[PDB]
C-alpha cells in the first residue's frame, strides 16, 4: 500500500520539477520586450508590437495590407515586400513566388516572415495613397445576358488617383440572396429560364472581401465603375450554390450604400512607340475600354491601335456606340468582333469562330514584324492559352505579351 503513495508522490514531484526547470529556462532565455518595425526609413508610421507571429498580423493593424488577398493558400503570390535590414532568411516556401534575383534584392513574403525581431521595410512607389471610401451606387444595370455594369460615387466630387487597368478592393456583409430577384430584362431572360437559374441561392454568415477591376480612365472624373459576371455553378454538380460576391453585387441598385478600398494594379501599358494590339473576350471589356480610352483621349497619342473582341451573339456585345465613335474620331484605332454562336435571327455576315483564329487569319499572318507589337490581353483562361500559343508560334517573346487573368 505504501508503494502506491510513494509512486503518486514521486510522479508528481518529478513532473513538477521538470516543469519548473523549463519555466525558469524560458524566463531567462527568451526575450519579453517589445520590438519595432520601420517603413521606408521614416521615423513616422512605425509599428511596435510584441515579438512573434507573421508580419501580416502587425501590418493588418495599421491597414497596410499591400493587396493581401487571402489568409491562406497563397496562390496569388501578391504578398511580397522588400525587407532592408539583415533579418531572417528567405524560407524554402517562398522561392515558388520569388526568383533568386528578387531574393538577392531583399524581396520576402510578408505572410511567412517572422517578426520576433526588429526589421526595416521598404514599399515601392510610395503606395501610402491607398485609402478606403464610403460610396453610393449610381447605377447597376445590365448590358448583356450575364454581366452587369456597376457604378460608384466618390463623395464631395473627389477623384481617386489611379492608372488604367488597375483593380480595387471590395467588401460585403453577411447576406442571403436568390437569383429570382434579379432584374434581367426580357431579351436576356430567354437564356436564364432555359437552365432555370432562378432556382439557385447562396449565403454567407460573415463579411467577405474580394478584388475587382475598374472600367474607367483618369479623366472620367468623380466615379469608379466595374463590370461583373455571374458565377453560376457548373452543370455536372449543380447541387453546389453560386458565387457569393458576384451575387451580392448583382443585388444592389441606385442609391445603395457600399464601401471600397485598395486601388492596386500591375497591368499598366508601356511607354514605347510600338504598335498596340488589344485582344479581349467576354467580361474582360473593362480594362480594354480603360486602356483604349486612356491612349486616345488623355494622352492623345498617334500610335497605331486595334481592338479585337470575342463575343457570343449579336445580343452579347456592348459599348459599340463608343468603339465605332472612337474609330471615326481617330484614324489610329480599328475595331473588330467575332462570335461563336450566330443564331439564324442574327443573320451575321462578319467574322465567326474564336477570336484568335480570326486575328491570325486576317491581320497577323501577313504582318510585317509581329514581334515588335505589344499585346494586351484579358479573357477566359482557355482562350488566353489559345492566343498565347498562336503568338508563340509567331515568335513573340514574353516581354511583349501582357495579361491580367481574372481569377488567377
Amino acid at each position: 500500500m505504501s508503494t502506491i503513495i510513494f509512486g503518486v508522490v514521486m510522479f508528481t514531484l518529478i513532473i513538477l520539477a521538470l516543469v519548473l526547470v523549463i519555466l525558469f529556462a524560458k524566463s531567462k532565455l527568451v526575450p519579453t520586450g517589445d520590438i519595432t518595425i520601420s517603413i521606408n526609413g521614416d521615423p513616422e508610421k512605425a509599428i511596435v508590437t510584441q515579438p512573434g507571429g507573421k508580419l501580416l498580423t502587425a501590418l493588418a493593424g495599421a491597414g497596410v495590407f499591400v493587396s493581401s488577398a487571402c489568409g491562406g493558400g497563397g496562390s496569388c503570390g501578391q504578398c511580397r515586400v522588400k525587407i532592408k535590414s539583415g533579418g531572417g532568411d528567405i524560407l524554402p516556401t517562398e522561392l515558388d513566388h520569388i526568383s533568386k534575383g528578387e531574393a538577392r534584392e531583399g524581396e520576402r513574403l510578408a505572410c511567412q516572415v517572422a517578426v520576433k525581431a526588429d526589421m526595416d521595410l521598404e514599399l515601392p512607389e510610395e503606395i501610402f495613397g491607398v485609402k478606403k471610401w464610403e460610396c453610393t451606387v449610381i447605377s447597376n444595370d445590365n448590358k448583356a445576358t450575364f454581366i452587369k455594369e456597376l457604378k460608384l460615387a466618390i463623395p464631395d466630387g473627389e477623384s481617386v488617383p489611379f492608372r488604367a487597368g488597375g483593380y480595387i478592393q471590395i467588401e460585403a456583409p453577411a447576406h442571403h440572396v436568390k437569383y429570382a430577384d434579379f432584374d434581367v430584362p426580357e431579351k436576356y431572360r430567354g437564356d436564364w429560364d432555359k437552365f432555370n437559374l432562378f432556382r439557385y441561392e447562396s449565403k454567407v454568415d460573415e463579411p467577405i472581401i474580394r478584388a475587382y477591376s475598374m472600367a474607367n480612365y483618369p479623366e472620367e472624373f468623380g466615379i469608379i465603375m466595374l463590370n461583373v459576371r455571374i458565377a453560376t455553378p457548373p452543370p455536372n454538380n449543380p447541387n453546389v450554390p453560386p458565387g457569393q460576391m458576384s451575387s451580392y453585387i448583382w443585388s444592389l441598385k441606385a442609391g445603395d450604400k457600399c464601401t471600397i478600398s485598395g486601388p492596386f494594379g500591375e497591368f499598366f501599358a508601356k511607354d514605347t512607340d510600338a504598335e498596340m494590339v488589344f485582344i479581349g473576350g467576354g467580361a474582360g471589356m473593362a480594362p480594354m475600354r480603360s486602356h483604349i480610352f486612356d491612349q486616345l483621349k488623355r494622352l492623345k497619342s498617334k500610335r497605331k491601335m486595334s481592338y479585337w473582341y470575342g463575343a457570343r451573339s449579336k445580343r452579347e456585345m456592348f459599348y459599340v456606340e463608343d468603339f465605332d465613335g472612337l474609330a471615326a474620331e481617330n484614324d489610329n484605332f480599328v475595331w473588330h468582333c467575332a462570335l461563336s454562336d450566330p443564331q439564324p435571327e442574327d443573320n451575321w455576315t462578319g467574322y465567326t469562330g474564336f477570336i484568335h483564329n480570326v486575328l491570325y487569319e486576317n491581320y497577323l499572318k501577313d504582318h510585317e514584324a509581329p514581334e515588335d507589337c505589344e499585346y494586351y490581353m484579358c479573357g477566359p483562361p482557355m482562350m488566353n492559352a489559345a492566343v498565347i500559343n498562336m503568338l508563340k508560334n509567331l515568335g513573340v517573346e514574353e516581354e511583349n505579351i501582357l495579361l491580367d487573368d481574372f481569377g488567377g
Binding site: 526568383s99 533568386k100 534575383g101 528578387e102 538577392r104 510585317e368 514584324a369 509581329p370 514581334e371 515588335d372 508563340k392 508560334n393 509567331l394 515568335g395 517573346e397 516581354e399
Partner: protein, 446 residues
C-alpha cells in the same frame, strides 16, 4: 609558361599547308542570327534593299544599342526564318563598293584615346560584336567594362590555321589593335600564344603568356581558368587575333576591314591550304570544285565544335576561322563493334589503332554506337585539364541540376570547352547542349 598535359590532339587526316593563297570568287555573304547567344533581332532592312558596308542590318532587343552591320555593299536577297519565325540568316548579294566611314588616328595616339570614344567607334562600326563575355559568352553590354581582355593568338583546333603566318602580314594592324585594347581595358590585356615570337605592344598593361601542350591548350576558357578565374562578379572579355587586326585597321584607316584568312581542310579536300575570303562568305561557293565526289558534310569551324553548313546556314560564322569537310558515315558493318579495329581511333586502348604511332585517320561523321547511359570508365579525366570534377559536373548537366553545376564550375565554361568530353563519351551524350540549357536557366532565374 603553363603546360597542359591532359588533352588530345585529334589525328584527323587532311592537314592544311600553312601557305596563304587567293580564294574563289564570292557573290553572297550572310549574317547568321542563331550564333549570337540570347539575341532577339529588330530588323532594319527588308528584301530588295540596297546596303553599304558597315550599314546596320538589325539590332538586339535584349542588348540595347548593339548593332549588327553588313560586311559588304550589295542588295538584300533573303531573310531566312525557321520554326517560330526564328531568324536564321540575312543574305546580301555583293554589288558595288559603297561604305560607311569613321574617324582615323595616328598610330601613336591610339594608346591614349578616350574609352567612351573607342566604344562609340566600335559600336557604330559594328565591330563591337567581336567581343564575348565569360560567363555566358554573350556580346558585352555597351555600358559595361571588364578588368581582363583575353586575346587568342594561338589555335590548337584540329586542321586549324597558324596564327603566326597571318599575323606576320599585318604586324602594324595587330599592334594598333593591341594598343586600342589596352586603352579600352580597365585592368590588363592577356595575349595568349605559343612559344614563338609575335609583334609586341610596348604598353605596360599588355602581357604575353605562353601556353604549351595539346588541345584545349589554345582555348580562351583554359586561359581564363589559369590567369583570371571568372564568376558572377568577375567577367572577362575574349577576342581572337584576326578581330584584333580588324580593330587596328578600323582605328588606323576609318574603314571596316572584313578580309579573313581561313583554313580549308579535311579528309576530302584535294588541296588543303589557307585561303583569303570575306566575313560571312558562302561556303557552298567557297568549296566549289574543292572536294572529292560523294556525300559530305561542310562544317563552319572545327569538327570538335562547329555548325553544319547546309541550306540557310551555309555561310561562314562570325567566330569561325576555318572550314572542315568530311564524309557522311552511313555504313552498316557486320559485327563492326567486335572487329580488331586497326583503322579505328579511340582514347582508350581497346583497338589495334593505338599501336601504330603517327597514323592519321579518314574520320567520318558516324556515331560508333547507340545512345546509352553513362558508364564512367574514366575517359573525361584524360581530356579535361581544368581543376574540376568532370564526371560529377557532366552528371549534373545530364540531370539538369543547375545549382549544383554552378558550384562545380559551369559558369567558367563554353560549349567548346566540353567538345572533347562529348568526343570521348561511350554513351554518346552531347554536353554542349546541356551546358547551354543550364546557362539559360541560370540567366533566367537571375
Amino acid at each position: 609558361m603553363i603546360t597542359i598535359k591532359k588533352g588530345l590532339d585529334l589525328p584527323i587526316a587532311g592537314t592544311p599547308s600553312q601557305v596563304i593563297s587567293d580564294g574563289k570568287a564570292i557573290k553572297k555573304v550572310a549574317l547568321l542570327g542563331e550564333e549570337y547567344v540570347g539575341m532577339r533581332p529588330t530588323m532594319h532592312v527588308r528584301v530588295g534593299d540596297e546596303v553599304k558596308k558597315a550599314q546596320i542590318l538589325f539590332e538586339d532587343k535584349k542588348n540595347p544599342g548593339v548593332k549588327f552591320t553588313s560586311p559588304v555593299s550589295g542588295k538584300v536577297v533573303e531573310i531566312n526564318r525557321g520554326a517560330k519565325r526564328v531568324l536564321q540568316s540575312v543574305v546580301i548579294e555583293v554589288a558595288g563598293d559603297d561604305q560607311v566611314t569613321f574617324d582615323k588616328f595616328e598610330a601613336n595616339q591610339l594608346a591614349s584615346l578616350n574609352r567612351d570614344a573607342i566604344k562609340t567607334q566600335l559600336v557604330e562600326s559594328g565591330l563591337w560584336t567581336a567581343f564575348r563575355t565569360r560567363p555566358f559568352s554573350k556580346v558585352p553590354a555597351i555600358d559595361s567594362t571588364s578588368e581582363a581582355i583575353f586575346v587568342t593568338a594561338m589555335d590548337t583546333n584540329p586542321l586549324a590555321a597558324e596564327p603566326t603566318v597571318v599575323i606576320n602580314e599585318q604586324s602594324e594592324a595587330f599592334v594598333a589593335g593591341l594598343d586600342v585594347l589596352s586603352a579600352l581595358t580597365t585592368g590588363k590585356v592577356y595575349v595568349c600564344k605559343k612559344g614563338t615570337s609575335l609583334p609586341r605592344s610596348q604598353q605596360p598593361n599588355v602581357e604575353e603568356h605562353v601556353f604549351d601542350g595539346p588541345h584545349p591548350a589554345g582555348l580562351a576558357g583554359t586561359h581564363m581558368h589559369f590567369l583570371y578565374p571568372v564568376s558572377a562578379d568577375h567577367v572577362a572579355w575574349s577576342i581572337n587575333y584576326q578581330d584584333v587586326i580588324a580593330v587596328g585597321q578600323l582605328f588606323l584607316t576609318g574603314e571596316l576591314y572584313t578580309q579573313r584568312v581561313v583554313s580549308l581542310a579535311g579528309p576530302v579536300v584535294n588541296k588543303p591550304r589557307l585561303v583569303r575570303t570575306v566575313m560571312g562568305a558562302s561556303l557552298e561557293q567557297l568549296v566549289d570544285s574543292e572536294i572529292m565526289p560523294g556525300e559530305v558534310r561542310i562544317i563552319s569551324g572545327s569538327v570538335l565544335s562547329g555548325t553544319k553548313a547546309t541550306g540557310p546556314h551555309a555561310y561562314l560564322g562570325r567566330y569561325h576561322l576555318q572550314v572542315s569537310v568530311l564524309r557522311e558515315g552511313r555504313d552498316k558493318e557486320l559485327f563492326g563493334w567486335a572487329m580488331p579495329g586497326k583503322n579505328k581511333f579511340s582514347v582508350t586502348r581497346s583497338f589495334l589503332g593505338h599501336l601504330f604511332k603517327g597514323q592519321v585517320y579518314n574520320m567520318t561523321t558516324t556515331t560508333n554506337g547507340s545512345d546509352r547511359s553513362m558508364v564512367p570508365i574514366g575517359n573525361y579525366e584524360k581530356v579535361m585539364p581544368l581543376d574540376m570534377e568532370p564526371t560529377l559536373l557532366l552528371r549534373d548537366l545530364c540531370a539538369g541540376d543547375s545549382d549544383s553545376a554552378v558550384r562545380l564550375g559551369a559558369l567558367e565554361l563554353d560549349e567548346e570547352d566540353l567538345a572533347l568530353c562529348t568526343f570521348v563519351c561511350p554513351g554518346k551524350y552531347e554536353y554542349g547542349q546541356l551546358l547551354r540549357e543550364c546557362l539559360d536557366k541560370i540567366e533566367k532565374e537571375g
